[PDB]
Paper text:
The disassembly of ESCRT-III is mainly mediated by the Vps4 protein that is a member of the type I AAA+ ATPase (ATPase associated with various cellular activities) family and oligomerizes into a functional hexamer with elevated ATPase activity upon binding to ATP6. Powered by ATP hydrolysis, the Vps4 oligomer, promoted by the cofactor protein Vta1 (Vps twenty associated 1), disassembles ESCRT-III polymers into individual ESCRT-III subunits available for recycling. Vps4 protein contains an MIT (microtubule interacting and trafficking) domain at the N terminus, a single ATPase cassette comprising a large ATPase domain and a small ATPase domain with a β-domain inserted within it, and a C-terminal helix8111213. In this study, using Vps4 from yeast, we solved the structures of the ATP-bound Vps4E233Q hexamer at 3.9 Å resolution and its complex with Vta1 at 4.2 Å resolution, both determined by single-particle electron cryo-microscopy (cryo-EM) without any symmetry imposed.
Numbering used by the authors:
A (entry chain G): 276 to 329
B (entry chain C), D (entry chain B): 119 to 437
C (entry chain H): 288 to 329
Write the structure that this text describes.
């Protein structure tokens, strides 16, 4: 009940965005396991700004 | 000598098969009606004894067969081209003879051959040695019983009709193309595929579900369903913070995965949570969306070229 | 020191992921921000 | 009749594998979760049936299989497509039938078929002899125990997914790309492969290596490792000039290879040399440098394009 059918696009987009954020976070953790701080910073920043945009 | 091949009972009803129920009508009239009212088939009208289904893989041809088996109340024998049809030399044909003998013995009976094309030859090594004589054995055995009295039904299945040689074709009875499911069929299948699990049962979004999926098979639909069904489970695996939901009016406390910041959000391993106190995230449209995302363009057009060509030429044709 | 701070960062990331798993966007934002600030502080 | 398949334990843990932790999760869910909590499979929640691992050769597909076997905690069957090709020209697939019977009789079991793009190559005309019959045998036998009561999981392996037919493609389920290792994964493999040798130090060298070595496989990495490990033995062999290093507190003067010009350079050979008095050269960057000079890239990028094309098409899901 209550569904216009144009939401699904935005919904899947935002889901993809969430997935990308999750990937970024994982990559940052990987970088931390390699004591690579700048990479970690960049990936968390990219996740952060990606989160902020929606 | 004999070698018994399974007559086990699947439990797939007519209602579990969504779509193109004209095939179902042909089935019921070809099998059940003869059984129910035998006196309707006296004289010059004689019951249909051969049926062969063709189309892309994954479209419930096997599923349909199992439904038939469930619904028959009859002996159902089912065998492939590799199954119990070889030797050093010679006696595969004898096995075929003994079989059809047994089929005659057991009225009613149904023989189901999957991938009927795989018993074919017109030139190669099998045409010199076996596969010719196999084909011949088949042809001769499908001849005389088809004349006058029969309690055997022959059920074929194939993905590739065009590689089954012309010799069988006109000697055999009734053939139907099984296409991929259309909007309505997909939608019905969605509803069937939901079963007992609650939330979300949105009737309105089912048609959106059937819309979004286009050209995918029964198998594909099943896969997407399963994929959606693991989503709450994967949540639980990634979950740390759980909270109580079922009140003290119920038998006991019951915990579900919850937002990490909440009042009542206590963090542990899902393995610590026992079945009595167990609760799972509901199924959202989002789970299904994700499931769809893992599914890709599944069915090649190249199938549609030759299958739609044979369809334009033969199609619903008896063959 | 540099070991426990990384652990804390990891924890915060995990918390952010849990939050996202339940579509709690502000929590996710704040936890990623804390992780990033802490990373900068190392 | 039986044809003996080994199910013993190749003791390779999860932690010995690097990367695609998401496929690892799928595997954990496909075997381990069923093992741990079977009662979670009442109603419409049903185990995954089939997984294909696809990608370039040498990417630890076999290694992955070993890890699976170690981690399965059940009967594990492993077979190459080389096995059960033919005996007489007539009889092959009966063995397949018996194999699947055996597997069904051992629930849970897991069948791993290597190089599923062999049998089933596939190319036309020549297929019509025994090979089409085999192709059929697969398709029909996967249809047999598949519904309701399953304790079989099928793992396939392939280098060439694009030549594996439509019929298998959307019947046989879940397909996962196994890529070549990236910088991270390479580095981790380097660190895994050490042994007792104290070698060259830090993580800096490791990350240098994993960076510098690119487009290579786990197998290739292993090769390089073995090479480097043998390089000090190679030093020992070729230089017969040795020299004392350690003090007299040990059993005796401890002798390592040096140049003919070196001070203390005694030139007797390995033959006279006692077990205790041995000083292997340390493992240097130069061993890895020479190893890289000797290491040529394996796989053409066109293959990468075809794997990538399949991935664009079917990808991280069966279809
Ligand atoms: N209404 C339906 N329409 C089509 N397929 C369905 C339907 N309901 C269930 N299925 C699926 O049908 C599958 C049974 O095999 P299926 O009949 O698809 O094989 P097939 O198309 O006969 O191919 P093959 O000839 O290779 O066996 C089940 O795995 C199930 O997911
Ligand atoms: N994480 C890893 N990734 C890739 N390969 C690895 C990994 N760990 C170990 N290996 C290597 O995998 C090798 C085992 O053979 P491998 O699985 O590479 O062959 P394959 O990929 O099955 O190729 P083919 O299909 O042609 O047999 C071992 O030599 C081992 O060193």
């Amino acid at each position: 009940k209550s569904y216009t059918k144009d939401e699904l696009t935005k919904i899947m987009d935002r889901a993809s965005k969430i997935e990308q954020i999750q990937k970024l976070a994982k990559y940052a953790i990987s970088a931390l396991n390699y004591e690579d701080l700048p990479t970690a910073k960049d990936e968390l920043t990219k996740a952060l700004d990606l989160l902020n945009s929606i | 000598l004999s070698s018994a091949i399974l007559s086990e009972k699947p439990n797939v009803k007519w209602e579990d098969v969504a779509g193109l129920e004209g095939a179902k009508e042909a089935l019921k009239e070809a099998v059940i009606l003869p059984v129910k009212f035998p006196h309707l088939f006296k004289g010059n009208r004689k019951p249909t004894s051969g049926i062969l289904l063709y189309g892309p893989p994954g479209t419930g041809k096997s599923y349909l067969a199992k439904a038939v088996a469930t619904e028959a109340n009859s002996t159902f024998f089912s065998v492939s081209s590799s199954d119990l049809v070889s030797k050093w030399m010679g006696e595969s044909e004898k096995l075929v003879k003994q079989l059809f003998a047994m089929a005659r013995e057991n009225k009613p009976s149904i023989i189901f051959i999957d991938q009927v094309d795989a018993l074919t030859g017109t030139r190669g090594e099998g045409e010199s040695e076996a596969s010719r004589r196999i084909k011949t054995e088949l042809l001769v055995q499908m001849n005389g019983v088809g004349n006058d009295s029969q309690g055997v039904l022959v059920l074929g299945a194939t993905n590739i009709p065009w590689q089954l040689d012309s010799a069988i074709r006109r000697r055999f009875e009734r053939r139907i193309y099984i296409p991929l499911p259309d909007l309505a069929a997909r939608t019905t299948m969605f509803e069937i595929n939901v079963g007992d699990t609650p939330c979300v049962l949105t009737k309105e979004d089912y048609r959106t579900l059937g819309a979004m999926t286009e050209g995918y098979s029964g198998s594909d639909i099943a896969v997407v369903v399963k994929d959606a069904l693991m989503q709450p489970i994967r949540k639980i695996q990634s979950a740390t913070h759980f909270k109580d939901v079922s009140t003290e009016d119920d038998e006991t406390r019951k915990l579900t995965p919850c937002s990490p910041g909440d009042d009542g959000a206590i963090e542990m391993s899902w393995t610590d949570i026992e079945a009595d106190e167990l609760k799972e995230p509901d199924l959202t449209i989002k789970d299904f969306l994700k499931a769809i995302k893992s599914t890709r363009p599944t069915v090649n057009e190249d199938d549609l070229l030759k299958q739609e060509q044979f369809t334009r030429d033969f199609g619903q044709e008896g063959n």
